[PDB]
Amino acid sequence: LPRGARTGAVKKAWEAYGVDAKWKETNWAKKQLQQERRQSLTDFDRFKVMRLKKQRRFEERKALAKI
Amino acid sequence: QKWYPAEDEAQPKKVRKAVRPWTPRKSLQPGTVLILLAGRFRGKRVVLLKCLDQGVLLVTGPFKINGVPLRRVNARYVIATSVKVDLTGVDQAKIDEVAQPKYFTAASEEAFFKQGEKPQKKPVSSTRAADQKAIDKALIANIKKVDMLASYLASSFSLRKGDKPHLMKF
Amino acid sequence: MSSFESVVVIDGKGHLLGRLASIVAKQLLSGQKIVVVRCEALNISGEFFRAKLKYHAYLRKMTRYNPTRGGPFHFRAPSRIFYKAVRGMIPHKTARGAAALERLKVFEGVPPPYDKKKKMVVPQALRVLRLQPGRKYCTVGRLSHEVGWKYQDVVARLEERRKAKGAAYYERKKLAARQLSEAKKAAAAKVDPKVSEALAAYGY
Amino acid sequence: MGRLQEYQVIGRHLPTEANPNPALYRMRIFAPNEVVAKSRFWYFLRGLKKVKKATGEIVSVNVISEKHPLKVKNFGIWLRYDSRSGTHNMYKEYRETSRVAAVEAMYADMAARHRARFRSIHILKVVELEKTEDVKRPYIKQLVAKNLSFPLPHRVPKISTKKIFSAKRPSTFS
Amino acid sequence: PSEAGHRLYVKGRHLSYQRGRRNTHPKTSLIKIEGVDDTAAANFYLGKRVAYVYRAQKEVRGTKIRVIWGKITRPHGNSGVVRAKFTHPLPARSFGASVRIMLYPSSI
RNA sequence: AACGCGACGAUAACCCGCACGGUAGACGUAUAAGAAUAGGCUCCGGCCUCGUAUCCUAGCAGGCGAUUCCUCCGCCGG
């Protein structure tokens, strides 16, 4: 990136290097996307997760008891 | 009337306070699942039927899902949840019947001898049980189609650790 | 973020003295029970000798001290050096003030009730967050040891024993971390994958 | 002193029969608002010449905005302050994106290292250093040096002040 | 069995009265709501009902529980503390005692 | 320390009458490495600003009977 580059020149390097695609792969963004999706959960979709983690947990325990 | 005014009790002046219809919040719609916060059915999730006058709300359980009958409740004492159920097939004529104000409102030997005794719990009436069944018949059949709503409505709302209601989206 | 706990245990290592004392005294008055462990590992800013003059200065301005309750008594252990700090920050001549100190409970080392419990930290009083890197600091254990605390080698040997018990705790927690992660991978093949995407679309 | 702005203040003597069309003096004044910019203008003008506010009028007050506030440049500020000992002259260098930002930098810097307030401090000349090697100053010199790249060790992370208790000891590697 | 709770209130602590250095006014009390830390979060809890529940060591209605009711009037400070007005002022020895903040009246 | 403390030895019962069921503050009152902050952890793949996490969390304040599961919890003994 050239020093002091104006907005057009940084945009040229932005699209060429693909900063947005690399940021989505970055683990910092996945934690952010997990956080935003968690915060948008309504009360009825909170009742799914209580029911739904229970179903997932049951296959975890016979696997855990196996080993 | 009959009597001359026997004292100097002045009549009140004509007050300028006309009664105007109550405008409910946008989140209250027919079919919205509601969370009761006060009363004997606190914490219970219920389904709204009709918005009545002066902040009163007509709400059913339905009875076979959680146990809440046809009842009234105040708007400020309830929380509206983003899930909305369908009321296709529900009798609007029967709902308009149970929305009337008269519905939920209504010296001898036996009078003297029952002084101090605790009154016996009178049971449910035939019409109250029959109107309940007529309203709910198309209601829980609607509830079975949407997945996990039956266990949702039979459950009770509560707050866990870290549950901050100013951040919870309902 | 303003959570109410039953009792909160504060690890004392790497914490500055008066900033921990100011935060603790506000929670005691608010109604929080406080337990402080490792009072010998607390830190006081500045060089060691600066701590020595203010120890000599406190004994200077008091004629005929009580040997048992005060005077050089307060400096003869690290637990009660901290108790002297919290007491000057609390209305101790009031019954609300006395009640706030009964919520406090300070120790040197980690007693057996509190080594199996979780020890939190206070970010606003941590030495490495508040002090400049080149600034020099002293430990309250070596302040009390040069005043007359007698059990510095005692609390050391009990602490090196506690590390050894803690080493066996991780080695048990290592094996649980293997088995839990393995069971997560093992049951994911039969986790009914209509529902695995449902949890991923909700954040779990 | 605050978010100062630049002000062009032009004024002249109230005309008489003897001197119609007076001389129209102009001054550039840094001030937080216009009523301070006009006050500084009459303060200086009575200092050099005999004109005063009572016998004078102000013909214009205009804001001089930055031509390129998105470009970073070096500023040389000539200066004059009155201490207890007397008045002295010095010259500071600042690196900001605007002249009012450099004067903001000066006023905090001069009050810190020399304890000089707004009344004592007189602006002499603030001018953009157009070309390198006209920078006469060491801490600016290392910044204008070739391929600047420094680490950020021991950065204290933002922990919210209302989270009094923390479960994990924070890390200072971010 | 459910093995779940029944709490429908936010937890709070009675901090003090409205006061200066030395002039305390008992008719308004200060409450620290759990989870609120800015003035923005305190704006949610305004005009919510607030109950103070205690025990009295005598049964008057078959119960030793007595309640004092109130409401959250305005935010206090920048840290989420709120001002509460009750029917009667809270005692004094309840400084640092539990307070139940209800979720009614609701506008959600 | 006679108004601090630890270990140990030896150590108070049936009958008759009659008065009542605190605590500065429970409501999921769940969560043990150590050590450093010019570093560290690990499953050795990788990972650490973020405890904004993990566990637990449905039913008359939580019933009855099933279908169905050998998961979770509790009491006594070794």
Coordinates of N, CA and C in Angstrom, one line a residue, chain B:
Chain B
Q1 N -84.7 16.1 42.4 CA -85.3 14.9 42.9 C -86.4 15.2 43.8
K2 N -86.6 14.3 44.9 CA -87.7 14.5 45.8 C -87.4 15.7 46.7
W3 N -86.2 15.8 47.3 CA -86.0 16.7 48.4 C -85.4 18.0 47.9
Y4 N -85.8 19.1 48.5 CA -85.0 20.3 48.4 C -83.6 20.1 49.0
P5 N -82.6 20.8 48.5 CA -81.3 20.7 49.1 C -81.2 21.3 50.5
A6 N -81.0 20.4 51.5 CA -81.2 20.8 52.9 C -79.9 21.4 53.4
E7 N -78.8 21.5 52.7 CA -77.6 22.2 53.1 C -77.1 23.1 52.0
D8 N -76.0 23.7 52.2 CA -75.4 24.5 51.1 C -74.3 23.8 50.4
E9 N -74.5 22.4 50.2 CA -73.6 21.6 49.4 C -73.7 22.0 48.0
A10 N -72.6 22.6 47.5 CA -72.6 23.1 46.1 C -72.4 22.0 45.1
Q11 N -73.0 22.0 44.0 CA -72.8 21.1 42.9 C -71.4 21.2 42.4
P12 N -70.8 20.2 41.8 CA -69.5 20.4 41.1 C -69.7 21.1 39.8
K13 N -68.7 21.7 39.3 CA -68.7 22.3 38.0 C -68.6 21.3 36.9
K14 N -69.0 21.7 35.7 CA -69.0 20.7 34.6 C -67.6 20.5 34.2
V15 N -67.1 19.3 34.3 CA -65.7 18.9 34.0 C -65.6 18.7 32.5
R16 N -64.4 19.1 32.0 CA -64.1 18.9 30.6 C -63.2 17.7 30.3
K17 N -63.6 16.5 30.6 CA -62.8 15.3 30.4 C -63.6 14.3 29.7
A18 N -63.6 14.3 28.4 CA -64.3 13.4 27.5 C -63.6 12.1 27.5
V19 N -64.3 11.0 27.4 CA -63.7 9.6 27.3 C -63.4 9.4 25.9
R20 N -62.2 9.0 25.6 CA -61.7 8.7 24.3 C -61.2 7.3 24.3
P21 N -61.1 6.6 23.1 CA -60.7 5.2 23.1 C -59.2 5.0 23.4
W22 N -58.9 3.9 24.1 CA -57.5 3.6 24.4 C -56.8 3.1 23.2
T23 N -55.6 3.6 23.0 CA -54.8 3.2 21.8 C -53.7 2.2 22.4
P24 N -53.8 1.0 22.1 CA -52.8 0.0 22.6 C -51.5 0.2 21.8
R25 N -50.4 -0.4 22.4 CA -49.1 -0.4 21.7 C -49.2 -1.3 20.5
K26 N -48.3 -1.0 19.5 CA -48.2 -1.8 18.3 C -47.9 -3.2 18.4
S27 N -47.3 -3.6 19.5 CA -46.9 -5.0 19.8 C -48.0 -5.9 20.2
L28 N -49.2 -5.3 20.5 CA -50.4 -6.1 20.9 C -51.2 -6.4 19.7
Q29 N -51.3 -7.6 19.2 CA -52.1 -8.0 18.1 C -52.8 -9.3 18.5
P30 N -54.0 -9.5 17.8 CA -54.7 -10.8 18.1 C -54.0 -12.0 17.7
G31 N -53.5 -12.8 18.7 CA -52.7 -14.0 18.4 C -51.4 -13.9 19.0
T32 N -51.0 -12.8 19.6 CA -49.7 -12.6 20.2 C -49.6 -13.5 21.5
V33 N -48.5 -14.2 21.6 CA -48.2 -14.9 22.9 C -47.7 -13.9 23.9
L34 N -48.3 -13.9 25.1 CA -48.1 -13.0 26.1 C -47.5 -13.6 27.3
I35 N -46.7 -12.9 28.1 CA -46.1 -13.4 29.3 C -46.7 -12.7 30.5
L36 N -47.4 -13.4 31.4 CA -48.0 -12.8 32.6 C -46.9 -12.6 33.6
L37 N -47.0 -11.4 34.2 CA -46.0 -11.0 35.2 C -46.5 -11.0 36.7
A38 N -47.8 -10.8 36.8 CA -48.5 -10.6 38.1 C -49.7 -11.6 38.2
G39 N -50.3 -11.6 39.4 CA -51.5 -12.4 39.6 C -51.1 -13.8 40.0
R40 N -52.2 -14.6 40.0 CA -52.0 -16.0 40.4 C -51.4 -16.9 39.3
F41 N -51.4 -16.4 38.0 CA -50.9 -17.1 36.9 C -49.6 -16.5 36.4
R42 N -48.8 -16.0 37.3 CA -47.6 -15.3 36.9 C -46.6 -16.2 36.3
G43 N -45.8 -15.6 35.3 CA -44.8 -16.4 34.7 C -45.3 -17.3 33.6
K44 N -46.6 -17.3 33.3 CA -47.2 -18.3 32.4 C -47.4 -17.6 31.1
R45 N -47.2 -18.4 30.0 CA -47.3 -17.9 28.6 C -48.7 -18.2 28.1
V46 N -49.3 -17.2 27.6 CA -50.7 -17.2 27.2 C -50.9 -16.5 25.9
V47 N -52.1 -16.8 25.2 CA -52.4 -16.3 23.9 C -53.5 -15.3 24.0
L48 N -53.3 -14.1 23.4 CA -54.3 -13.0 23.4 C -55.4 -13.3 22.4
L49 N -56.6 -12.9 22.7 CA -57.7 -13.0 21.8 C -58.2 -11.6 21.3
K50 N -58.6 -10.7 22.2 CA -59.1 -9.4 21.8 C -58.6 -8.4 22.8
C51 N -58.4 -7.2 22.3 CA -58.1 -6.0 23.1 C -59.4 -5.3 23.5
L52 N -59.6 -5.3 24.8 CA -60.8 -4.7 25.3 C -60.6 -3.2 25.6
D53 N -61.5 -2.6 26.4 CA -61.4 -1.2 26.7 C -60.6 -0.9 28.0
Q54 N -60.0 0.3 28.0 CA -59.3 0.8 29.2 C -58.2 -0.1 29.7
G55 N -57.4 -0.7 28.7 CA -56.2 -1.4 29.1 C -56.5 -2.8 29.5
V56 N -57.7 -3.3 29.5 CA -58.0 -4.7 29.8 C -57.8 -5.5 28.5
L57 N -57.3 -6.8 28.7 CA -57.0 -7.7 27.6 C -57.7 -9.0 27.9
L58 N -58.4 -9.5 26.9 CA -59.1 -10.8 26.9 C -58.1 -11.9 26.4
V59 N -57.8 -12.9 27.3 CA -56.7 -13.8 27.0 C -57.1 -15.2 27.5
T60 N -56.8 -16.2 26.7 CA -56.9 -17.6 27.0 C -55.6 -18.3 27.1
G61 N -55.6 -19.5 27.6 CA -54.3 -20.2 27.8 C -53.8 -20.7 26.5
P62 N -54.4 -21.7 25.8 CA -55.7 -22.3 26.2 C -55.6 -23.3 27.3
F63 N -56.8 -23.8 27.8 CA -56.8 -24.4 29.1 C -56.1 -25.8 29.1
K64 N -56.2 -26.5 28.0 CA -55.6 -27.8 27.9 C -54.1 -27.8 27.8
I65 N -53.5 -26.6 27.5 CA -52.0 -26.5 27.3 C -51.3 -26.2 28.6
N66 N -51.7 -25.1 29.2 CA -51.1 -24.6 30.4 C -52.0 -24.7 31.6
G67 N -53.2 -24.2 31.5 CA -54.2 -24.2 32.6 C -54.9 -22.9 32.9
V68 N -54.5 -21.9 32.1 CA -55.1 -20.6 32.2 C -56.4 -20.6 31.4
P69 N -57.5 -20.2 32.1 CA -58.8 -20.2 31.4 C -59.0 -18.9 30.6
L70 N -60.2 -18.7 30.0 CA -60.6 -17.4 29.5 C -60.6 -16.4 30.7
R71 N -59.9 -15.3 30.5 CA -59.7 -14.4 31.6 C -59.4 -13.0 31.0
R72 N -59.5 -12.0 31.9 CA -59.0 -10.7 31.6 C -57.7 -10.4 32.3
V73 N -57.0 -9.4 31.7 CA -55.7 -9.0 32.3 C -55.4 -7.6 31.8
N74 N -54.6 -6.9 32.6 CA -54.3 -5.5 32.2 C -53.0 -5.5 31.3
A75 N -53.0 -4.5 30.4 CA -51.9 -4.5 29.4 C -50.5 -4.2 30.1
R76 N -50.5 -3.4 31.1 CA -49.2 -3.0 31.7 C -48.7 -4.1 32.5
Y77 N -49.5 -5.1 32.9 CA -49.0 -6.2 33.7 C -48.7 -7.4 32.8
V78 N -48.4 -7.3 31.5 CA -48.1 -8.4 30.7 C -47.0 -7.9 29.7
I79 N -46.3 -8.9 29.2 CA -45.2 -8.7 28.2 C -45.5 -9.4 26.9
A80 N -45.4 -8.7 25.8 CA -45.8 -9.2 24.5 C -44.5 -9.8 23.9
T81 N -44.7 -11.1 23.4 CA -43.6 -11.8 22.8 C -43.8 -11.9 21.3
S82 N -42.6 -11.9 20.6 CA -42.6 -11.7 19.1 C -43.3 -12.9 18.4
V83 N -43.6 -14.0 19.0 CA -44.3 -15.1 18.4 C -45.8 -14.8 18.3
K84 N -46.4 -15.0 17.1 CA -47.8 -14.7 16.9 C -48.4 -16.0 16.3
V85 N -49.6 -16.4 16.8 CA -50.2 -17.6 16.4 C -51.4 -17.3 15.5
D86 N -51.8 -18.2 14.6 CA -52.9 -18.0 13.7 C -54.2 -18.2 14.4
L87 N -55.2 -17.4 14.1 CA -56.6 -17.5 14.7 C -57.6 -17.8 13.5
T88 N -57.1 -18.5 12.5 CA -58.1 -19.0 11.5 C -58.9 -20.1 12.1
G89 N -60.2 -20.0 12.0 CA -61.2 -21.0 12.5 C -61.7 -20.7 13.9
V90 N -61.2 -19.7 14.5 CA -61.7 -19.3 15.9 C -62.9 -18.5 15.7
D91 N -64.0 -18.8 16.4 CA -65.3 -18.1 16.3 C -65.2 -16.7 16.8
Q92 N -65.2 -15.7 15.9 CA -65.2 -14.3 16.3 C -66.5 -14.0 17.0
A93 N -67.6 -14.7 16.7 CA -68.9 -14.4 17.4 C -68.8 -14.9 18.8
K94 N -68.1 -16.0 19.1 CA -68.0 -16.5 20.5 C -67.0 -15.6 21.2
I95 N -65.9 -15.1 20.6 CA -65.0 -14.2 21.2 C -65.7 -12.9 21.6
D96 N -66.5 -12.4 20.7 CA -67.3 -11.2 20.9 C -68.3 -11.4 22.0
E97 N -68.8 -12.6 22.2 CA -69.7 -12.9 23.3 C -68.9 -12.8 24.7
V98 N -67.7 -13.5 24.8 CA -67.0 -13.5 26.0 C -66.3 -12.2 26.3
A99 N -66.3 -11.2 25.4 CA -65.7 -9.9 25.5 C -66.7 -8.9 26.2
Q100 N -67.9 -9.3 26.5 CA -68.8 -8.4 27.1 C -68.4 -8.1 28.6
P101 N -68.7 -7.0 29.1 CA -68.3 -6.7 30.5 C -69.1 -7.5 31.5
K102 N -70.4 -7.8 31.2 CA -71.2 -8.5 32.1 C -70.8 -10.0 32.3
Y103 N -69.9 -10.5 31.4 CA -69.6 -11.9 31.4 C -68.8 -12.3 32.6
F104 N -67.7 -11.7 32.8 CA -66.8 -12.1 33.9 C -67.2 -11.5 35.2
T105 N -68.1 -10.6 35.2 CA -68.6 -9.9 36.4 C -69.5 -10.8 37.2
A106 N -70.6 -11.2 36.6 CA -71.6 -12.1 37.3 C -72.0 -13.2 36.3
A107 N -81.9 -12.2 55.6 CA -81.9 -12.5 57.1 C -82.7 -13.7 57.4
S108 N -82.1 -14.8 57.8 CA -82.8 -16.1 57.9 C -82.1 -17.0 58.9
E109 N -82.5 -18.2 58.9 CA -81.7 -19.3 59.6 C -80.3 -19.4 59.1
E110 N -80.2 -19.6 57.8 CA -79.0 -20.0 57.2 C -78.0 -18.8 57.1
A111 N -78.6 -17.6 57.1 CA -77.7 -16.4 57.1 C -77.0 -16.2 58.4
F112 N -77.7 -16.5 59.5 CA -77.1 -16.3 60.8 C -76.1 -17.4 61.2
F113 N -76.4 -18.6 60.8 CA -75.6 -19.7 61.3 C -74.4 -19.9 60.4
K114 N -74.3 -19.3 59.3 CA -73.0 -19.3 58.5 C -72.2 -18.0 58.7
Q115 N -72.3 -17.4 59.9 CA -71.5 -16.3 60.2 C -70.1 -16.7 60.8
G116 N -69.1 -16.4 60.0 CA -67.7 -16.8 60.4 C -67.2 -18.0 59.7
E117 N -68.0 -18.8 59.0 CA -67.6 -19.9 58.3 C -66.9 -19.5 57.0
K118 N -65.9 -20.3 56.6 CA -65.3 -20.0 55.3 C -66.1 -20.6 54.2
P119 N -66.4 -19.7 53.1 CA -67.3 -20.2 52.1 C -66.6 -21.3 51.2
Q120 N -67.5 -22.2 50.7 CA -67.0 -23.3 49.9 C -66.7 -22.9 48.5
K121 N -65.7 -23.5 47.9 CA -65.2 -23.2 46.5 C -66.3 -23.7 45.6
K122 N -67.0 -22.7 45.0 CA -68.0 -23.1 44.0 C -67.3 -23.6 42.7
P123 N -67.8 -24.6 42.0 CA -67.2 -25.1 40.8 C -67.5 -24.2 39.6
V124 N -66.9 -24.7 38.4 CA -67.0 -24.0 37.1 C -68.5 -24.2 36.6
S125 N -69.0 -23.3 35.9 CA -70.3 -23.4 35.3 C -70.3 -24.1 34.0
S126 N -71.5 -24.6 33.5 CA -71.6 -25.3 32.3 C -71.2 -24.4 31.1
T127 N -71.7 -23.2 31.1 CA -71.4 -22.3 30.0 C -70.0 -21.9 29.9
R128 N -69.4 -21.7 31.1 CA -68.0 -21.3 31.2 C -67.1 -22.4 30.6
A129 N -67.4 -23.6 31.0 CA -66.6 -24.8 30.4 C -66.9 -25.0 29.0
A130 N -68.1 -24.8 28.5 CA -68.5 -25.0 27.1 C -67.9 -24.0 26.2
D131 N -67.9 -22.7 26.7 CA -67.4 -21.6 25.8 C -65.9 -21.7 25.8
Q132 N -65.2 -22.3 26.8 CA -63.8 -22.5 26.8 C -63.4 -23.5 25.7
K133 N -64.2 -24.6 25.6 CA -63.9 -25.7 24.7 C -64.2 -25.2 23.3
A134 N -65.2 -24.4 23.1 CA -65.5 -23.9 21.7 C -64.4 -22.9 21.2
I135 N -63.8 -22.1 22.1 CA -62.8 -21.2 21.7 C -61.5 -22.0 21.4
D136 N -61.1 -22.9 22.3 CA -59.8 -23.6 22.1 C -59.8 -24.6 21.0
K137 N -60.9 -25.1 20.5 CA -61.0 -26.3 19.6 C -60.2 -26.0 18.3
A138 N -60.4 -24.8 17.8 CA -59.6 -24.4 16.6 C -58.2 -23.8 17.0
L139 N -58.0 -23.6 18.3 CA -56.8 -22.9 18.8 C -55.6 -23.9 18.9
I140 N -55.8 -25.0 19.7 CA -54.6 -25.9 19.9 C -54.3 -26.7 18.6
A141 N -55.4 -26.9 17.8 CA -55.1 -27.5 16.4 C -54.2 -26.6 15.6
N142 N -54.4 -25.2 15.8 CA -53.4 -24.3 15.2 C -52.1 -24.4 15.8
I143 N -52.0 -24.7 17.1 CA -50.8 -24.7 17.9 C -49.9 -25.9 17.5
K144 N -50.5 -27.1 17.4 CA -49.8 -28.2 16.9 C -49.0 -28.1 15.6
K145 N -49.5 -27.2 14.7 CA -48.8 -27.2 13.4 C -47.4 -26.6 13.5
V146 N -47.3 -25.4 14.2 CA -46.0 -24.8 14.4 C -45.2 -25.6 15.5
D147 N -44.0 -25.9 15.1 CA -43.2 -26.8 15.9 C -42.7 -26.1 17.2
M148 N -42.8 -26.9 18.3 CA -42.3 -26.6 19.7 C -43.1 -25.5 20.3
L149 N -44.3 -25.1 19.8 CA -45.1 -24.1 20.4 C -45.9 -24.7 21.6
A150 N -46.2 -26.0 21.6 CA -47.0 -26.6 22.6 C -46.2 -26.6 23.9
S151 N -44.9 -27.0 23.8 CA -44.1 -27.0 25.0 C -43.7 -25.6 25.4
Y152 N -43.7 -24.7 24.5 CA -43.4 -23.3 24.8 C -44.6 -22.7 25.6
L153 N -45.8 -23.0 25.2 CA -46.9 -22.4 25.9 C -47.2 -23.1 27.2
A154 N -46.8 -24.3 27.4 CA -47.0 -25.0 28.6 C -46.0 -24.7 29.6
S155 N -44.9 -24.0 29.2 CA -43.8 -23.7 30.1 C -44.1 -22.4 30.8
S156 N -43.2 -22.1 31.8 CA -43.3 -20.9 32.6 C -42.0 -20.1 32.4
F157 N -42.2 -18.8 32.3 CA -41.1 -17.9 32.1 C -40.4 -17.6 33.5
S158 N -39.1 -17.5 33.4 CA -38.3 -17.2 34.6 C -37.0 -16.6 34.1
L159 N -36.3 -16.0 35.1 CA -35.0 -15.3 34.8 C -33.9 -16.1 35.4
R160 N -32.8 -16.3 34.6 CA -31.7 -17.0 35.1 C -30.6 -16.0 35.4
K161 N -29.4 -16.5 35.8 CA -28.3 -15.6 36.1 C -27.8 -15.0 34.8
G162 N -27.5 -13.7 34.8 CA -27.1 -13.0 33.6 C -28.2 -12.7 32.6
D163 N -29.4 -12.9 33.0 CA -30.6 -12.6 32.1 C -30.9 -11.1 32.5
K164 N -30.6 -10.2 31.6 CA -30.8 -8.8 31.9 C -31.9 -8.3 31.0
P165 N -33.1 -8.0 31.6 CA -34.3 -7.7 30.8 C -34.2 -6.5 30.0
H166 N -33.3 -5.5 30.3 CA -33.1 -4.4 29.4 C -32.3 -4.8 28.2
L167 N -31.7 -6.0 28.1 CA -31.1 -6.4 26.9 C -31.8 -7.6 26.2
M168 N -32.8 -8.2 26.9 CA -33.5 -9.3 26.3 C -34.5 -8.8 25.3
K169 N -34.4 -9.4 24.1 CA -35.4 -9.2 23.0 C -36.5 -10.2 23.2
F170 N -37.7 -9.7 23.4 CA -38.9 -10.6 23.6 C -39.6 -10.8 22.3

